[PDB]
Design a protein around this ligand. Structure first.
Ligand code: F43
Ligand SMILES: C[C@@H](OP(=O)(O)O)[C@H](NC(=O)CCCCCCS)C(=O)O
Ligand SMILES: O=S(=O)(O)CCS
Ligand SMILES: O=S(=O)(O)CCS
Ligand SMILES: [Br-]
Ligand SMILES: [K+]
Lengths: 548, 443, 258, 548, 111
C-alpha cells in the first residue's frame, strides 16, 4: 500500500517515516548491534592467537552507534539483516557470485573439430564428443590422462569443477548426453531460446569451470590458461593424437586467443590486471551473467536484479577492495538493492512511461529523454522530502544520486530501448539533482556525470561506445562508486523493454543458465540474503587438507 | 663513411647490380627506401568497409560472439565507397600537394588510408594513423547517410570495436602492420610487432623479398632498441646486408649449390668453406683427433656469413619438403651443427639457436604459440634473437604448399591486400639496392 | 673442404661422427620388410593409396620464385603426400642412437626433415613416402636401432631414464612390445600410439650390452666418461666462452681473451 | 655415509640403488598409492553433490602405477610424503607461503612524519607513533575509525591481519612498544643486524599485512591499496587531522607510489598482471624473503633453502598454475628440494671450491667459472650413471638439467661472490650436460640456456642485469620451468659466500623475520613437509560465516 | 647531462623510447670503455643507468629521464604527448605563467 519502501522503513525504525524529529545518543553505542557484539566477542577470543598484538576495538576513533544502527531488508524479500552481513568479506554468497564468474571461460569447438577432420584426418562423431566430455571432467579438476608418475589435485577440493557443452544446432543437442549439456530448449522460454539459437547459429561451445580454489590461490588470468591446458590434453586422450605434434599448436592458440570468450579483458598499466577481473567486464556482459530474464516476466525486476549484482561486484568487490580496500563501499551499493527504494522509483517510471509512450513505443529523441528523466528524478527526490526516514536511510547523497538517476535511466530505456538514450537520461538526472538539493554526491562523485552529457552520444575514439560495451575501464567511469552497477542496470533496461533474451553476448547468457553453478544467478538479491544469514555454502574451502 | 667494408649488391635473380658499395649505404640511417618503408608502415591503415557495413546491418560489434539486439543499421557503405574515400581524404589532407592517399581495395569492399607524413612528424607515436582514420571514417559514414545521434555510437563500435574499455583494438574493422604500443614486449619493439604471414602476404610469397622485408624491419628495430650502437652497429649492418639483402650473392650461391641434393649439414660445410676461403675465419688450434678449431678473423662478418647460410638452410630444408613446420628445427640444428662442426659461435651467439628451441616447442606443444606464421619479433617466444630468426621463418612460409591452419590466407587477408599493392613493400630487395646506389657516393 | 662433423678424442665422439657422415654406411643388423614397418607406425596399411592433404606441385599455379625452384623437392612433396611422424625413446643404458645424435644425423643425411629433440623422446616428421623408405633401410635395419634399448613410441614415452626390466627391455606402460621367451626376439603387439595390431611384428634378437658399448653415442661412468674426452670438453668450453664474449663485445680484440 | 641421497633412495626403493634391472607391472596400478586410494574414495563420495556429472577416474587415459609410484623425502628432514602431498593445491603450507608474500607491503614513515611536522604543524613523538600503531591494527583488518554508521569486516576472518614497525634508528627502537616492533637486534645475529641497519640508515618503515582472505577473493594489486587506504585513516585518527584536507593527498601518493615497497611489480600486456604477483618478484627479493640466513651458519643450506622456496613459487604456483594450470609442475620443482640430491652435489661443489679457491677467494674470471662449472657438472651426471635409482627418481631430463646446473652455479658463486659469474657457470653446465647424455630437458627447455652465455655478461638494454634484479619477466626466463627457482638460489649463493645479511633489499629481509607471520620462512623445506602431512593451519578460511 | 639524438634516428623509429634506449647504451659503452670496467662488473653499470629493466617493463630506478613516460603507461592510444607532469611544464618555463600555459596548451592540443 502506497510507496513500496514504507513496509521496510516501518521495520527499520519504530517511528512514523514522515516524522522530522527523533531521539539520539540513547542506544548505548555499538552494543545495540548483535553483529558488533559478535565481532568484539570474536576479537577478545582471538587475543591469545595474535599474542600481545592489539586487534579490533570499537573504542578507537569514532564511537559507532550514536544514531540507530539500522538493518537492511533485501529488495523483493522478507529478509532483514544487519549491514555488516552485506559486506563482501562477511558474505560467502557475494564471494561465490564473483568466484563463479572468475572461474568461467567459454571456448569454441568447431575450429578444433575442423582441424581433427582436415589436417589430422580423424572423424568427429557425437559418441567421440561424449568421450571427450568425460575426459575433460576428469582432467579439468586436476586429473592425469597422458603421462606416467603424475601427481593429482584432490577431488574433494575441486568438486565444483566441471566442463559442459551447449549448441545452437538442435540436431547435435539431442545426440549429446544430458549430463554434459547446457540445454537452451529446457532452461529458457521458447521465445528466448529461438532468439539465442538464431544469434549463436549452428556453432558448438564448451563452458569450462576451473575450480574455485584456483582463482583464490592465483588470479583471473589463470582461468583461460588452466582451461586451455586441460582442453588440449583431453583432445590428445579422447582422439588418441600424438603427445606433442605440429597440429597441437593450432589447439593451444585457438583455446587461448582465437575461439576463446573471457568474462573480462586486461586493464592498462596504471590499474594493471589480467583478464577475468571485475574491471575488464563490460556492462552488457554482466547483464548477460544475471539470469532473471528467463525466470521473471517483469522488465523492472530484471533491470533491478542486474543493478544489485552490478553494485555488489563493481562497488563492493572491485572499487571497494581491488581498487581501494578496508571498510569498503558496502552501503554505497546496498542503497541500490535494499528496502525496495530503487524498486518503488523504477516502478513509478515504468508506469509513467507505459501510459504516456508505452513500453518500447518511442524512438529516442532529446524531447523523450528530457521528459522521462526529469519526471522520475523530481518524483524520487520528492519521496526523500516526504519521508525523513527514507532520507536518514539513504544518508549519503551519492547513494541518493545513484538511486534517483538509475530509476531515471531505466525508465528512459523502457520507452526507447536504446542504452545510450537511458545513459543520457541518467546525466540529466544528476545535474537536476544537484540544482534541487544544492548538493550531489561526495567530493569527486560527478566527474563522469559532468563529462557524461557530452560523451553519452559522442563519436570520438575515447568518448564513444554503446553502454553495452562500456565498463569499469571506460575513461570517465574508471574511479567512482554509485555509477557502474547502475549502468549495468540501464543496459538491461534497454533489452528488457524489447523482451530480448540477451543484451550483448548470447554465449555468456547460455553459460550462466547452468544449474551446476554454485551461485543462483536467477535470484541474486535472495542469494545475497542467504549469504548474510550464513546459509550459503561456497566452494574453495580447504577442509580435506587442514587440521580439524 | 665510418666503416671500410665494401659489399657487392645482388638481386632476387642472383644477378650483379653493383660492386664495392659502402656497407653503410644499406644502413637504416642512410638508405632512403628504408626511411620510406618505416614512414609508410607508420602511416598506412587497412580499412574493411564490407566488415564495417556487415557489423552495423547485424549489430555484431565489440569482439567475437558479441551482438547487440535492437541497435542495427542498414547503410549502403560499400556501394558509396567512392564518396566515403572522397570524404576521408578531405578530412585527413593538409594540402593538395601532400602525400595523403585514400584508395579503394577489392572494388571498394576494402580501403587503404595513408595519413599525410606531417601528421606523424607532430605525433609522438604510430597509433595516430589508426585513430585519425577511425575518426575520419565515422564522420564520413555519419554525415553521408545522416546517421541519427542515438545510432552514431554503433558506428564507433563497428570501426574501433570495444575501445576504450579495452586498451587494444578488440573487434576493430581497421588494421595496421603495427600492433598497439600497450602490447609491446620491450621498449622499441614496435617495428617487431609484424606477423610472419603479413611479411609473406605483402611480398606475394617471394622468398628473397620476404627475407629482405623481415630483415629490414627486424634490423631497423635493433637500431630503435639501442641494440645496434657502438661495437654492435657493424654486427647488425653486416647481418642486414648478408642475411636479408643477399650481399656478395651468398644466400643464392649457397641455395644454388645445395638445391638439388643438399641437406642442412651440406649448407653448413658450404658456408664454412666459403668463410675460410674469403679469410673471414682462420684455423686457431688443431685438436688431438685432428679436428681443426677455427677462430674468427672478423667477428661481425663471420656472424653475417653464418646468418646468410641460415636463410639458405631454411630455403633448402623447408623447400625440399614444401612445408613451413621444418623452420623451427632447421634454425635450431643449423646453429647446433655449425658450432660442433668448427668450434665457432653460431648465429647471434646462441640467441638464434635458443629462439628456435622455444619456437620448436610452441609450434609443437599445449602451452601456447601455433603455426610458424603467427609469430613475430614482438612475441615472447621469438623475440630473443636480435633480428636473425624472423627473416628465415618468412622464407619457409613462402615455400609451404598450404599445410597450415593459420596460413597467409586465414591471418593476412585484410592486411596483405593493401601493402602488396605498394611497390616498395612487395619487392623491398629491388628498391633498397636502388636506394643504396642513390646514396653510395654521398656518404 | 672435408667436414669434421663432431669434436672429440673417444670412441663415443667417433660413433657420433660416423652417424653424421653421409658417406659412412651404417652396419645392417636386421631385415624388416616394408609391409611390417608401416603397421608399427600405425598411419596406413600396405598395398593401399597414400592419403593427400594438398594436390601435386605440377597441378598448382604458384607465383614465380627463382630461388624456390632451385631447391629440388623430395618425391613426397612432388605428389602432395601427407606428413606423418615416428618417435623413438632411447635408453640411457648404451642405446645405439641418442636424442641430439639422431637430430644431427637426420639434418646431415636426409632432405626436408622436421626433427624434435626431448630427453625422453625424439620425433621425426617427414613426407610419408620418403619417411617409410628411411625408417626401414636406415632407422630400423641398421646399427642405429636396437629392439630393446630403442622404444618406438607416440605417447607415454616414459622409460628412457628408467631401470631395465627382468629380460633386458625398457619400461613401456602401454605394452607395445613384449620379450618372447621362445624366439629370444622382441615382438611389437601394438603400434607407437598404443592400438593393438591383429598380426604381431617381430623386430629381432636383443643385442648384448658388450657390443652396445662399442656403438653407443652416450657417455656414461659405466662406459666412456665425458671426463675422458678432454677434446670435446675443450670445444664446449670454447663455444661457451665465444658466446659470452660475443654478447659482451663483438670485437676481434675482445676475442683475444679466448 | 658416502652420498647424501643414498639414505632417501634406500627408503624409496627396496632395491640396491646401483641395480640396473627391476620388476614392473606388478604394483596393481594406482592402488599402490594410499593417496590415489583417498582421491577415488573422495570422488565416489562426492558423486551425489555433482549430480550425474562424472568426475575424477584413474581409468581415463594412461593407467598410473605401472612403475613404482615413489614417495619423496624432504631435503634435510626425515619426512617421507607422497608426491601428490607436494602439489600446491593439496598443500596449505605452500598456499600460505605465497599468501604471506602477496599480503605483504612495506611503507616508509619518515615522509609522512615530515608532512606532519612541516605543513601540518603536528609534532611526532614515540607515544603518538605507538597510538598510530594501535589504530592501524584495528583499521587494517576492516575496523572503523572516522565515520558513523560504518559496517566492519569480521575479526575472526582477519586474525592474521596486523601492521608492525621497524627502524635502523636504535634510539627510536627502544622507545616503541615491543608488540608493534620487528626488532632487528633480537631477530638477527649482531654481525647481520649491523649490516642491515647500516644499509637501511636511521629511517623508519611500516610493514602492513593485509588479511589473507583479501588476496584470495581479489588479487596482489589490492594489497598496496588496502594498506594505503587504512594507513591514511589511521593517520587522520591518531593525529586528529581534517577528514579530507589538501595535505591528505601527499599521504595517499606517498603510501601508493613514492615511499612504498612492493614484493612484485606489474607485468607487460601479454602476461598482464598487477603488482605483488609471482611474475613481478625479482630473484634477489625472493632470496631476501627466505630467513635461513639468520638461523643457519651453513652457506649451502641457505642457498638450497632459497632454491626450494623459488622452485615451489615460480614453477608450481607461477608457471604451474598462473601461466599454465591443471596437473601442473610439482615434480619439476620437487627434484630441487627432495631426497638430498641437489644437497649432495652442492656440498661437493662447496668442498671442491673451499679447498682449491677458498670461499670468496677468487675474483670472477672465465678460467674460474669454467673450472668449477665443469667439475660440479661432471660429478652430478656421474652420480646419475653410478646409481640407476637416482636416474629413475629424476626421470625427467629437465629435472636433471636444473639440479646439475644449480649445483654448478651455486659453487661458482661460492668462489666468486658474483651472481652473474654463477649465472654464467649455469649456462656452461647446460651445454656440457647436452653433450654428455646427448639430451637435455623437454622440447623447449634450453631457450634461455642457449641465449644464456651471451646475455649473462651482456650490456644491452633487454639483455643486461645483475641476477639479483632479473626475474620471471626477464625476456629469456619468462616461459620455462627448472630455471627461475634455481636462479634465486644462485643469487643467494653469491651473498652466503660473503656472509651478507641480505642480497638485494634489507627492508624485505627485516620484514620477513617477524614471528607474527603464519609461514616459517626460516625453514621452508620442513614447512612444506608440515603442509604435506596436513599439519599446517593456514589463514583465509571462512569458518565464521559458513554453515557447519 | 643533456643528450639529443640526431632527428634521423627518430625518422626511422616507430616511437619516442629510442632516445632513452640509445642514450642508455651510449652511456654504458662510454663508461665501460673509459674506465676499462671488468666484464663481470659491467652488469652493474646497466642497473645504474636503466634501473630494473627488462624485468620491469618501465624505467624503475633509472638515472636517465625524458619528458615523455614509457608507452606501456599510456591511459589511451595517442596519449604519449600528455604524459608530462605539471611541474615539468612549470620548471621548463622557469615559473612564467603565459609561457607555462602556452607549453601545456601546445602539447595538450597537439596531443
Ligand atoms: C603430453 C605432453 C606434451 C606437453 O606439452 N606436455 C606433456 C604433458 C604435460 C601434462 C601432463 C598431463 C597428464 O598427464 O594428464 C603436465 C602435467 C602439464 C599440465 N598440462 O597440467 C606436464 N606435462 Ni610433461 N611433465 C613432466 C615431464 C615430462 C617429460 C617426461 C620424460 C619421461 O621420461 O618421463 C617429457 C619431456 C621430455 O621428454 O623431456 C614430457 C613431455 C610431455 N608432457 C608430453 C607427454 C610425453 C609422453 O607421452 O610421455 N613431460 C618431466 O620432465 C618431469 C616433470 C613432469 C611434469 C609433472 C610434474 O612436475 O609433476 C609434467 C608437466
Ligand atoms: C608463450 C605465451 O603463450 P601465448 O603464445 O601467448 O599463448 C605465454 N605462455 C607461457 O609462457 C606459459 C608458461 C607456463 C607453461 C610452460 C612451462 S615450460 C603467455 O601466456 O604469455
Ligand atoms: O570525503 S570524500 O568525498 O573525499 C570520500 C567519500 S567516500
Ligand atoms: O613435451 S614437451 O616438451 O612439449 C612439454 C614438456 S612439459
Ligand atoms: Br665401454
Ligand atoms: K586471488
Amino acid at each position: 500500500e502506497k510507496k513500496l519502501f514504507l513496509k521496510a522503513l516501518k521495520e527499520k525504525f519504530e517511528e512514523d517515516p514522515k516524522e522530522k524529529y527523533t531521539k539520539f545518543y540513547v542506544f548505548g553505542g555499538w552494543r545495540q548491534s548483535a553483529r558488533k557484539r559478535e565481532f568484539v566477542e570474536a576479537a577478545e577470543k582471538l587475543a591469545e592467537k595474535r599474542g600481545g598484538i592489539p586487534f579490533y576495538n570499537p573504542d578507537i576513533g569514532v564511537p559507532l552507534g550514536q544514531r540507530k544502527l539500522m538493518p537492511y531488508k533485501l529488495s523483493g524479500t522478507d529478509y532483514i539483516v544487519e549491514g555488516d552481513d552485506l559486506h563482501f568479506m562477511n558474505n560467502a554468497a557475494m564471494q561465490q557470485f564473483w568466484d563463479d564468474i572468475r572461474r568461467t571461460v567459454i571456448v569454441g569447438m568447431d575450429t578444433a573439430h575442423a582441424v581433427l577432420e582436415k589436417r589430422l584426418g580423424v572423424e568427429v562423431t557425437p559418441e567421440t564428443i561424449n568421450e571427450y566430455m568425460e575426459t575433460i571432467n576428469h582432467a579439468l579438476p586436476g586429473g592425469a590422462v597422458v603421462q606416467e608418475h603424475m601427481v593429482e589435485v584432490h577431488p574433494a577440493l575441486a568438486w565444483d569443477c566441471y566442463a559442459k557443452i551447449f549448441t545452437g544446432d538442435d540436431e547435435l543437442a539431442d545426440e549429446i548426453d544430458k549430463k554434459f549439456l547446457i540445454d537452451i530448449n529446457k532452461l529458457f522460454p521458447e521465445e528466448q531460446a529461438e532468439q539465442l539459437k538464431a544469434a549463436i547459429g549452428k556453432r558448438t561451445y564448451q563452458v569450462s569451470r576451473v575450480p574455485t580454489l584456483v582463482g583464490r590461490v592465483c588470479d583471473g588470468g589463470t582461468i583461460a590458461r588452466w582451461s586451455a591446458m586441460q582442453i588440449g590434453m583431453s583432445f590428445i586422450t579422447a582422439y588418441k593424437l600424438c603427445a606433442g605434434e605440429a597440429a597441437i599448436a593450432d589447439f593451444s592458440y585457438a583455446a587461448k586467443h582465437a575461439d576463446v570468450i573471457q568474462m573480462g579483458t586486461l586493464l592498462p598499466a596504471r590499474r594493471a590486471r589480467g583478464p577475468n577481473e571485475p574491471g575488464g567486464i563490460p556492462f552488457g556482459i554482466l547483464a548477460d551473467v544475471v539470469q532473471t530474464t528467463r525466470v521473471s516476466d517483469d522488465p523492472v525486476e530484471q533491470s533491478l536484479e542486474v543493478v544489485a549484482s552490478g553494485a555488489m561486484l563493481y562497488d563492493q568487490i572491485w572499487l571497494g577492495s581491488y581498487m581501494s580496500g578496508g571498510v569498503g563501499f558496502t552501503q554505497y551499493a546496498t542503497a541500490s538493492y535494499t528496502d525496495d527504494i530503487l524498486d518503488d522509483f523504477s516502478y513509478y517510471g515504468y508506469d509513467y512511461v507505459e501510459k504516456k509512450y508505452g513500453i518500447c513505443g518511442a524512438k529516442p529523441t532529446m524531447d523523450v529523454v528530457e521528459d522521462i528523466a526529469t519526471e522520475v528524478t523530481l518524483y524520487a527526490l520528492e519521496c526523500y522530502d516526504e519521508f525523513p526516514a527514507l532520507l536518514e536511510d539513504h544518508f549519503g547523497g551519492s547513494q541518493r544520486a545513484a538511486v534517483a538517476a538509475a530509476a531515471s535511466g531505466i525508465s528512459v530505456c523502457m520507452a526507447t530501448g536504446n542504452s545510450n538514450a537511458g545513459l543520457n537520461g541518467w546525466y540529466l538526472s544528476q545535474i537536476l539533482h544537484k540544482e534541487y538539493h544544492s548538493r550531489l554526491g561526495f567530493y569527486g562523485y560527478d566527474l563522469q556525470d559532468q563529462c557524461g552529457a557530452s560523451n553519452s552520444l559522442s563519436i570520438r575514439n575515447d568518448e564513444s561506445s554503446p553502454l553495452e560495451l562500456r565498463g569499469p575501464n571506460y575513461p570517465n567511469y574508471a574511479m567512482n562508486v554509485g555509477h557502474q552497477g547502475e549502468y549495468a542496470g540501464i543496459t538491461q533496461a534497454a533489452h528488457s523493454a524489447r523482451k530480448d533474451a540477451f543484451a550483448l553476448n548470447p554465449l555468456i547468457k547460455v553459460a550462466f543458465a547452468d544449474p551446476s553453478l554454485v551461485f543462483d544467478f536467477s535470484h541474486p538479491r535472495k542469494e545475497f540474503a542467504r549469504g548474510a544469514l550464513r546459509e550459503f555454502e561456497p566452494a574453495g574451502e580447504r577442509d580435506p587438507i587442514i587440521p580439524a | 663513411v665510418k666503416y671500410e667494408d665494401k659489399i657487392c649488391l645482388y638481386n632476387a635473380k642472383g644477378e650483379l647490380v653493383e660492386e664495392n658499395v659502402p656497407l653503410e649505404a644499406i644502413s637504416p640511417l642512410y638508405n632512403p627506401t628504408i626511411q620510406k618503408l618505416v614512414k609508410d608502415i607508420k602511416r598506412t591503415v587497412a580499412v574493411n568497409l564490407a566488415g564495417i557495413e556487415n557489423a552495423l546491418k547485424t549489430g555484431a560489434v565489440g569482439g567475437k560472439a558479441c551482438v547487440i539486439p535492437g541497435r542495427t543499421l542498414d547503410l549502403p557503405i560499400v556501394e558509396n565507397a567512392e564518396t566515403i574515400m572522397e570524404y576521408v581524404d578531405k578530412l585527413l589532407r593538409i594540402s593538395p600537394d601532400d602525400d595523403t592517399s585514400v584508395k579503394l581495395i577489392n572494388d571498394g569492399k576494402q580501403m587503404a588510408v595513408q595519413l599525410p607524413s606531417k601528421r606523424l612528424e607532430v605525433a609522438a607515436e604510430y597509433s595516430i594513423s589508426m585513430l585519425n582514420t577511425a575518426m575520419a571514417l565515422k564522420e564520413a559514414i555519419i554525415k553521408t547517410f545522416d546517421v541519427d545521434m542515438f545510432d552514431a555510437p554503433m558506428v564507433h563500435a563497428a570501426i574501433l570495436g570495444r575501445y576504450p574499455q579495452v586498451p587494444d583494438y578488440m573487434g576493430a574493422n581497421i588494421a595496421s602492420l603495427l600492433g598497439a604500443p600497450t602490447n609491446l614486449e620491450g621498449l622499441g619493439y614496435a617495428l617487431r610487432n609484424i606477423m610472419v604471414n603479413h611479411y609473406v602476404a605483402t611480398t606475394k610469397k617471394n622468398i628473397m623479398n620476404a627475407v629482405a622485408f623481415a630483415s629490414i624491419m627486424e634490423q631497423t628495430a635493433m637500431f630503435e632498441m639501442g641494440d645496434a650502437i657502438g661495437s654492435f652497429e657493424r654486427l647488425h649492418l653486416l647481418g642486414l646486408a648478408y642475411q636479408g639483402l643477399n650481399a656478395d650473392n651468398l644466400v643464392i650461391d649457397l641455395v644454388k649449390a645445395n638445391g638439388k641434393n643438399g641437406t642442412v649439414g651440406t649448407v653448413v660445410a658450404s658456408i664454412v668453406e666459403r668463410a675460410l676461403e674469403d679469410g673471414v675465419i682462420t684455423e686457431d688450434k688443431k685438436m688431438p683427433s685432428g679436428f681443426v678449431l677455427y677462430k674468427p678473423v672478423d667477428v661481425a662478418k663471420w656472424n653475417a656469413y653464418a646468418a646468410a647460410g641460415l636463410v639458405a638452410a631454411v630455403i633448402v630444408n623447408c623447400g625440399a619438403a614444401r612445408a613451413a613446420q621444418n623452420v623451427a628445427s632447421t634454425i635450431l640444428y643449423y646453429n647446433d651443427i655449425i658450432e660442433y662442426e668448427t668450434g665457432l659461435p653460431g648465429v647471434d651467439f646462441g640467441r638464434a639457436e635458443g629462439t628456435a628451441v622455444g619456437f620448436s616447442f610452441f609450434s609443437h606443444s599445449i602451452y601456447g604459440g601455433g603455426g610458424p606464421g603467427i609469430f613475430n619479433g614482438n612475441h615472447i617466444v621469438t623475440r630473443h634473437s636480435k633480428g636473425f630468426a624472423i627473416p628465415p621463418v618468412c622464407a619457409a612460409m613462402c615455400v609451404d604448399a598450404g599445410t597450415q591452419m593459420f596460413s597467409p590466407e586465414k591471418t593476412s587477408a585484410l592486411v596483405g591486400a593493401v601493402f602488396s599493392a605498394i611497390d616498395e613493400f612487395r619487392e623491398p630487395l629491388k628498391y633498397v639496392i636502388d636506394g643504396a646506389l642513390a646514396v653510395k657516393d654521398k656518404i | 673442404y672435408k667436414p669434421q662433423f663432431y669434436p672429440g678424442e673417444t670412441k663415443i665422439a667417433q660413433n657420433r661422427r660416423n652417424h653424421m657422415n653421409p658417406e659412412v654406411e651404417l652396419e645392417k643388423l636386421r631385415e624388416i620388410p616394408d609391409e611390417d614397418v608401416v603397421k608399427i607406425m600405425g598411419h596406413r596399411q600396405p598395398g593401399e593409396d597414400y592419403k593427400t592433404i594438398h594436390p601435386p606441385l605440377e597441378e598448382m599455379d604458384l607465383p614465380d620464385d627463382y630461388v624456390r625452384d632451385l631447391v629440388e623437392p623430395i618425391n613426397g612433396a612432388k605428389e602432395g603426400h601427407r606428413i606423418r611422424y615416428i618417435q623413438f625413446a632411447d635408453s640411457m643404458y648404451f642405446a645405439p642412437a641418442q636424442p641430439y645424435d639422431r637430430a644431427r644425423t637426420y639434418m646431415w643425411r636426409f632432405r626436408g626433415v622436421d626433427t624434435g629433440t626431448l630427453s625422453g623422446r625424439q620425433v621425426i616428421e617427414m613426407r610419408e613416402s620418403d619417411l617409410e623408405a628411411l625408417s626401414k633401410n636406415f632407422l630400423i635395419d641398421t646399427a642405429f636401432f636396437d629392439p630393446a634399448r630403442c622404444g618406438i613410441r607416440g605417447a607415454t614415452v616414459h622409460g628412457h631414464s628408467l631401470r631395465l626390466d627382468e629380460n633386458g627391455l625398457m619400461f613401456d606402460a602401454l605394452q607395445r612390445y613384449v620379450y618372447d621367451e621362445k624366439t629370444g626376439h622382441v615382438v611389437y603387439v601394438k603400434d607407437q600410439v598404443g592400438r593393438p595390431l591383429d598380426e604381431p611384428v617381430d623386430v629381432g634378437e636383443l643385442l648384448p650390452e658388450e657390443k652396445l658399448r662399442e656403438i653407443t653415442t652416450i657417455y656414461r661412468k659405466d662406459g666412456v666418461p665425458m671426463r675422458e674426452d678432454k677434446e670435446l670438453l675443450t670445444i664446449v668450453k670454447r663455444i661457451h666462452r665465444a658466446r659470452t664474449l660475443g654478447g659482451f663485445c663483438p670485437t676481434e680484440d675482445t676475442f683475444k681473451q679466448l
